[PDB]
Amino acid sequence: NLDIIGKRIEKIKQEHETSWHYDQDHPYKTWAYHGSYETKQTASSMVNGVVRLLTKPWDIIPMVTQMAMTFKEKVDTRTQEPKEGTKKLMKITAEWLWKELGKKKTPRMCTREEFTRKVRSNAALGAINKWKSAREAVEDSGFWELVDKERNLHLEGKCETCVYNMMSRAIWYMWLGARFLEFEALGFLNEDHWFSRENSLSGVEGEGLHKLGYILRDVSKKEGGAMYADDTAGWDTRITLEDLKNEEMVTNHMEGEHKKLAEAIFKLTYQNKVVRVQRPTTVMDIISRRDQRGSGQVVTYGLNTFTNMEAQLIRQMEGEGVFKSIQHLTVTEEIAVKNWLVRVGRERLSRMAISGDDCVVKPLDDRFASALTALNDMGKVRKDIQQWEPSRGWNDWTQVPFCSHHFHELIMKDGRVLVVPCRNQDELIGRARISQGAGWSLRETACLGKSYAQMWSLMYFHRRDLRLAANAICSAVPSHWVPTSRTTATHEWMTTEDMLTVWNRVWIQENPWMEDKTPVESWEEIPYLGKREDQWCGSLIGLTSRATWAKNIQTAINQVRSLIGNEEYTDYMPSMKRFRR
Ligand SMILES: CS(=O)(=O)NC1CCCC1
Numbered sequence: 250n251l252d253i254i255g256k257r258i259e260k261i262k263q264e265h266e267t268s269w270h271y272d273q274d275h276p277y278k279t280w281a282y283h284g285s286y287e288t289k290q291t292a293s294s295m296v297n298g299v300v301r302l303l304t305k306p307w308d309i310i311p312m313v314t315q316m317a318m319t320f321k322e323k324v325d326t327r328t329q330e331p332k333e334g335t336k337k338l339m340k341i342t343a344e345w346l347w348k349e350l351g352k353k354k355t356p357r358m359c360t361r362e363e364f365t366r367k368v369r370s371n372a373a374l375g376a377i378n379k380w381k382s383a384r385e386a387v388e389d390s391g392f393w394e395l396v397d398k399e400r401n402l403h404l405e406g407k408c409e410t411c412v413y414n415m416m417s418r419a420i421w422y423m424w425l426g427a428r429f430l431e432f433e434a435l436g437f438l439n440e441d442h443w444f445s446r447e448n449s450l451s452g453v454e455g456e457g458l459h460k461l462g463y464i465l466r467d468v469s470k471k472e473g474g475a476m477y478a479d480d481t482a483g484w485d486t487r488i489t490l491e492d493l494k495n496e497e498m499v500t501n502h503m504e505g506e507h508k509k510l511a512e513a514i515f516k517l518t519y520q521n522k523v524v525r526v527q528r529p530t531t532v533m534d535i536i537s538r539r540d541q542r543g544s545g546q547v548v549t550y551g552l553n554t555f556t557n558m559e560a561q562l563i564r565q566m567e568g569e570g571v572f573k574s575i576q577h578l579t580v581t582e583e584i585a586v587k588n589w590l591v592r593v594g595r596e597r598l599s600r601m602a603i604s605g606d607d608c609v610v611k612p613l614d615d616r617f618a619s620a621l622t623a624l625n626d627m628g629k630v631r632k633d634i635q636q637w638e639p640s641r642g643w644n645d646w647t648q649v650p651f652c653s654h655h656f657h658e659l660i661m662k663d664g665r666v667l668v669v670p671c672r673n674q675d676e677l678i679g680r681a682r683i684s685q686g687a688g689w690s691l692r693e694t695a696c697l698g699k700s701y702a703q704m705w706s707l708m709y710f711h712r713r714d715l716r717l718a719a720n721a722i723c724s725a726v727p728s729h730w731v732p733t734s735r736t737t738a739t740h741e742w743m744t745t746e747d748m749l750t751v752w753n754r755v756w757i758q759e760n761p762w763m764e765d766k767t768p769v770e771s772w773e774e775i776p777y778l779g780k781r782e783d784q785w786c787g788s789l790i791g792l793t794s795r796a797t798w799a800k801n802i803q804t805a806i807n808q809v810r811s812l813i814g815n816e817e818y819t820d821y822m823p824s825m826k827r828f829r830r
């Protein structure tokens with residue numbers, strides 16, 4: 250408790266000594282509360298006018314238009330301690346999994362140089378004054394002296410400045426210095442691809458949306474039961490102190506300074522947290538707790554993948570009858586669990602696709618469906634089903650939800666097979682119509698529109714409305730203007746290369762599931778979904794609104810070209826049969 254967090258709490262007190270006060274009307278039940286002080290401040294979603302002017306039929310579709318308009322009683326809940334048998338299964342599994350992930354990888358520190366390069370190319374590092382932006386702090390030796398002071402404090406096993414700022418979501422911003430120290434110690438998990446499919450067997454880190462359907466189809470080829478895709482209710486809030494101790498065992502594979510710097514992140518910032526929260530009644534609350542997930546988003550992704558892989562292997566063990574009860578593992582159940590892992594562990598990992606809190610599992614058989622005691626006792630309670638009701642599985646890989654998508658098998662006129670990503674088209678159009686942040690020029694707004702258009706051409710070319718809208722936006726934005734994003738899966742659409750050349754490289758040349766490497770010479774060789782399937786997944790094909798939009802698209806393109814002004818444009822519409830004379 251307060252020996253580890255006191256220094257941080259002490260330092261904050263003094264900077265607001267004029268305002269400090271132990272409030273009595275504090276709303277916290279499960280957070281430890283320490284004091285309050287005076288503040289006064291809050292970024293809503295803005296519309297992208299280039300994309301909206303070129304998607305007129307969607308102006309009257311509420312699922313699209315409502316997306317642009319506008320639980321913290323889950324952060325203030327508690328998770329019970331797992332039983333002794335559960336804690337044993339988790340420790341054995343976690344020990345075994347870090348060894349497997351570490352067989353072909355070497356833990357190592359990430360560098361100031363590496364951190365500086367990621368800040369100077371727009372990452373979402375989630376930092377918060379003294380310098381304007383992160384770009385400025387990073388080019389100033391004063392910052393690195395602050396970093397140095399905290400760094401030596403961490404080697405000494407103590408913390409002064411690593412404090413969270415709060416804002417079914419929750420993003421915990423720290424100052425850039427704290428982020429550096431986190432990245433220095435644990436950045437290797439992402440930077441060296443510990444959760445790649447080749448390294449982790451269950452993982453999909455660095456797999457583009459163009460690979461995920463092929464991966465699910467490969468899992469479907471295994472003998473076994475249904476495919477299960479159970480979502481957890483509020484994964485980050487169900488991370489237990491036992492979970493955080495099993496994650497910290499990655500430090501057992503480290504040495505020297507690195508080992509000590511990583512041990513300090515886990516001990517001082519993850520297993521003990523200090524957070525500042527805006528309360529309207531406007532004070533700042535300084536609260537603490539030991540458990541739940543609060544790390545940078547990239548480290549959170551890798552540790553969520555780790556703990557999800559562990560939890561799903563244990564649910565598979567329960568279904569296969571490896572252990573009888575979570576109350577207590579006998580001496581010989583421990584050896585049975587260890588022996589299962591050594592004997593079939595890697596095969597069972599290959600039966601899963603795991604992306605942080607999101608999973609798909611094809612178990613050995615459907616006993617998995619009702620194997621719920623370990624999963625419930627680890628606190629990974631399933632969303633939108635009663636605690637003890639058996640899971641409903643999927644009989645067809647093309648129906649399974651994963652990473653907010655489903656996947657279609659699409660046969661090209663020439664016989665080759667594409668496995669393509671898909672989601673309801675209202676969600677895709679409604680997201681492309683939204684920007685984040687202030688001070689967008691017309692050129693910057695146009696370049697963000699172009700980024701969405703090129704993603705659609707690469708991932709969603711099979712949706713009639715999106716191929717047409719993508720061609721229209723690319724015709725409306727100057728040909729040489731570079732696609733942009735403010736928060737940056739692989740992003741092959743972020744380029745000024747011709748999109749047909751990029752399509753060929755992604756779907757044909759570099760596609761390990763495509764044996765025939767014959768290049769496609771035109772967009773007309775590239776197929777669509779069936780017309781009825783396109784409607785099922787939200788197409789407006791068949792509506793009068795959509796027909797008038799498609800017929801008159803050159804008028805929409807010319808409206809946007811007139812706003813942007815006298816620039817160099819390319820007509821991409823004749824790449825589609827109906828505008829090709
Ligand atoms: C703090 S983190 O390791 O989760 N994220 C990094 C911060 C800078 C680049 C990514």
Ligand SMILES: [Zn+2]
Nearest residue numbers: 408409410411
């Ligand atoms: Zn610290």
Ligand SMILES: [Zn+2]
Nearest residue numbers: 655671672786
């Ligand atoms: Zn679909």
